């Protein structure tokens, strides 16, 4: 159906820039396996009701599938499969041993008691146990779920398992206390600054003083605004949320703004900053600007106002296939989402890492080994859409889907 | 969804004659688990082709889920879980230690080799393992599906068991080589035969010399007229095929009728008969009319003109819910699908208890049980139709959702 | 102290036959002993750990058997004890068993609907290593039932992921999930078999004779209800713990249960003269049984006995000094663990119907019952007549032999 | 009473710092227990029932580490204790364990070698169902040794038909079956670092200090060696239960050792003077280290006590009535089951090179074990200075605190 649909269009899209024979295109476009199941829970009030919950493994030819879970009314199996597809190019352009996977259940969680969330997750463990594990399918938050619910999912799989294996590792996001790992909470954002770096050093411009805007305030946003002024020396000059922007050219300060959207909701009416639209903010003149917030922001519609150099893709799909060709033809460099925004995966990784190891890292060791394979993976893409003369989303495409069926060709699953 | 659709409102219809908590219809309205694959083949000529195989399994209160493989071009999933649902309540019926489920390929086995039926067998299986098993569900056949495809499934599951359990239980419709029960064949138009004769001696008639009419003549349509001659004393005045039926007043042999449609390719034109249409077969005044070709052949444009004492639903569905009030107004007792057909699962039960015990029956041991199960059904249900003063459909849904309430109730999964 | 007498009777029994003192030494101490937490969130919010056992005594025989106990006063040494009788019950009756028990320390009466489920759960959850169809096979046993073992079996097949018979891992099941006809009456109609058989071995008919029953639970109720309608006796007394009530003409079973049901009590039934529960002990009847506590025959009132078949159906109803006197006085008893063993057997029957995928007939389990019963007893009584010995001491020769004998021909025990 | 005196430590443990009811409650039971028959055939034929124990306390950070103790005292509630304690000191040094530990009530002394494995193989087949490498791994401990964890390993391999890293399954094996360098120094080595960060929190250069250690068993030995060769420190007393020496100029480790092997005890060293072990406890020195025997510092010493550091090596040889007193002259204690610490690292160091099939040098095992006993150290010292507490109760916060928050974070209890 429609996310699905558009998955599919860009793998077909992004096929036509490499060799790829027709019976390994089909079988990336089919997800291996789709399980739908019901999820029973007993309510605070004494009544049994069954919601709708979904596991996909996209393709496991590279290793066990990787993936988070979606708590979400709008839920659907295409949105799943879209972004079961799409982790599976992830987990492959920053190189990690992992196939593509991704879960939902259709909940409007904020309905829900403490123990009625407790009573969901537990139960999702129990319907879809037969098919994850540590070497099988790795979960991992997403849309409102978080580090407490992976701490009952664990739970509910060591107590099923009988803790004959490293139950830890069967899903990444955990609380530190059993098993999660340093770094997990800026690792979108970290990845992000990471490409962002390496993107300038390819454009020869040093971000030392330059100007950002980062479209969102949630975690990644906040984080992306944080990490680009302390570490890359950059001014943050305009943030936003669902709710408007804000713009100071002379730099806002990302702790403060925080403190402001948690006391008030928004980032609205920050003292010392004027507020101005989200499409004015993607307008703005500035090095690097970074949608963190919502899918299909830059269009056909806007695509020629934008005046960035780099468009750091933080969010997932926040450019548009029309719109990619308009940047390009402008000269502007776009990181694809699925590398720019990998960081996530790669510390979920290094979460798993430990956890089957039975050995823990700490913040130092987690942050280099996530800068050389953010650093390894964007010169990968960016050579390659330098050697080809192609879109970096196209080289991105390329970089992943050569490795997804490299190893579908030495499995023998396809005959060429 | 249409299949499902309909699948769950006649659930829904029933439940207005019976106290069944909200909490525990909606549970019975969701199948529990769902699985779509990938069932990858090696062609002939060596290109790989990926098809959609279907497991669903609608409930497992009562015990393993039960039935059967479609391979059919038209293949959906909704008719997958229409049919899943179905089961549930077969099994029930008959009062089996099962509970429902189904399976299929997306695939035209007419367009494939023998070989490449063997390796889609073994890659459904391949696909489908980890939520299979003795103890967990249990396919069989179906349309286009056999026992040489049961075989090579069974052969493909124990390959992968390693030998560790009872693996000829993990598939029924076996051939006798390899853990097969006596009765297979003729097990549908046996059971159906069985629920005549008490139809019959619930309404005080003698079917000794009474006249049968039978709709289809693939393997249970004629083994239900076969056996309606040779076992009830019923003289055959008409059959059907496809194309259309024959009719003598004298009576037909059916295995004639049948090496005629071997020699010639229908039953047209059989030598003294009369040629007539599949509605003039319908419309013929006989004691029992057996509908066992297709669904919805006895629909509210003809319900009027069907003249038959007992309607055998040998097929699964050919009344419709309009033509269920216009015969029962008439006085017309069916025998509902799922009771009348109930046979087949049935002897798929006594084959797989047969492979689970390491021990192999007669020919009249199957008989004898399967007479005792379908004759103690066909009273609980005529009893319950009696008493409550409904249609025999709405007292097969009593009978069957009854029992699987039961069950859920006393595992605690509905608590009312 | 429970545990201590269970050994006790054991050592006792020993000098009745010759067994190893290497085989002793192993049967006197149960093989596995399992104590855990068993943790539930109450209704209000607030977690409570409980205390539950499990005790598999002996698996010589093969898989363990027996029940849960659910009673604030619980102790292991209790657990210990029983799970101790239980391989001897099994083997009594000849089942491919061995013995186990366990118990949580909790008062349910306190505990929800709601809590309850989730302690049998979380008691699942905790002994799940040690149980299996093939392994260890619980049961209902004080404050347990049909319902709870429900739950159980549910909560194991969810852990086990429906891989093998899960239905087996644990029997007293409803009838919706592998339940097994005669599971009811089991227990009374186990008895009643041996009381046939006892009479016959005394020359006795049974027709019109007359029999009391202590106790008005559903063993007594089931007890005198089919010795009126199988044996054709009159039920001239039964009791409560509030008292018994007499009619040497006879009382209707299903009259005397209604009464009780609408009073509380059985006493004032209409027809019939309020009586002590000494008194019913005392009545001069062909049967006596009681079927309500334990040590209500003593070396005080042992004399004052004049039944001629005492039919253990409660447990240890009957002291050792008792035996001896009721013995004297030429009083056969049907010892408690050969009497009432019809529980634990129609337990097996349940077992096989879930190992084996196919459920009997009331009659396949009716005839099944009976033929078991009716060999044990003659085991049993052919025993104590060619060796001399009371019949209590006989059923220990039956069950412990069979026990030894499996260790030996495992290579257990050497001699 | 083993077991109630752990229980009263964590129900102080509790006075300095917010632990809700439930989670104490659940602290206070030891979450598995099992107590199971192993029997031997003798070499004179004879089969032998032994009683073994294993306690699994708390598995919260993860799989359960300690111990077997063959012993002919042993008794649960010593195992219980043990458990108990095991779960604090895997959490005081950040492993990813919870506590265990178990028994044999036995007197190896009495056995052959070839009863001595039947019954460490025995063991394992009765306690197989509950340890694994992810579940439950055992060790060494009274009276057994790497030659015992050798037979433990190969019949647990046995059983499990090589399926999983089974090297995996108990700690202290020989080298050529997944042992770890560094075993044997790994309590003194750790110490000497705990020593090292305790003089820099203390602003002391060791270099040219002077250490006395009581007891020149393996421990003391090798403190009082590592503690001259890496910390720069003069040696000028050691003791053992015949005596001490004393020489201000410095005693040599090795020489004092083949003394001792030659003798029987360091007394009547040529290269010294005799003197008591009360006088050794009472010297002037910069670092005293008990490791030897528990409550050699009380009441009744411990304002006599002169060292600026007490590296508590053996565990319990200061009372809590000397705690008080000796926080009150500024005397820093390093408490037991942190300065000890170093034999439970090491362990998890061989357990990791065992799931990971890659062995470790003796190099990189000293330089992980320095890190994490600096870090438990530092943690310790900044909780004790930060809440104004004793560097034992500061242990006793650090650990809870770990234990407590795994068990938040998968919702055993709700707060
Ligand atoms: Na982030």
Redo the contacts between chains.
Sequence with gaps: IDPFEMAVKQLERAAQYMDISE?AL??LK?????????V?I?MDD?????F?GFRVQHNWARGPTKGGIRWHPAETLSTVKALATFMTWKVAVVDLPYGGGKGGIIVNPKELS??EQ?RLARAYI??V???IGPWTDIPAPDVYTN??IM??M??EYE??M???????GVITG??L???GSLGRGTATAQGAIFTIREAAKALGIDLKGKKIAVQGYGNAGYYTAKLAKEQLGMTVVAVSDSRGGIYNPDGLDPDEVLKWKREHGSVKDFPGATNITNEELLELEVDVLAPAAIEEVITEKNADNIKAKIVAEVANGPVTPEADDILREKGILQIPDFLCNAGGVTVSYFEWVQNI????WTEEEVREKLDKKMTKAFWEVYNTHKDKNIHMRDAAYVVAVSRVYQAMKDRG???K
């Excluded at 089919?30 to 019901?38: L, Q, T």
């Excluded at 004494?46 to 069954?50: E, F, L, M, P, R």
């Excluded at 190891?357 to 823990?360: E, K, P, R």
Aim: hydrophobic share 30%; proline share 9%; glycine share 10%.
């Design positions: 019976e089909e079988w089919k997800p291996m396996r789709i399980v739908e199941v019901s029973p007993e004494g009544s049994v009701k069954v709708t403490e123990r407790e129990r319907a146990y037969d098919v580090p407490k701490g009952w664990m739970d107590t099923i009988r803790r004959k294996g490293p139950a830890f955990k609380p206390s059993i098993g190891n039975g050995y823990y699953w396809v005959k």
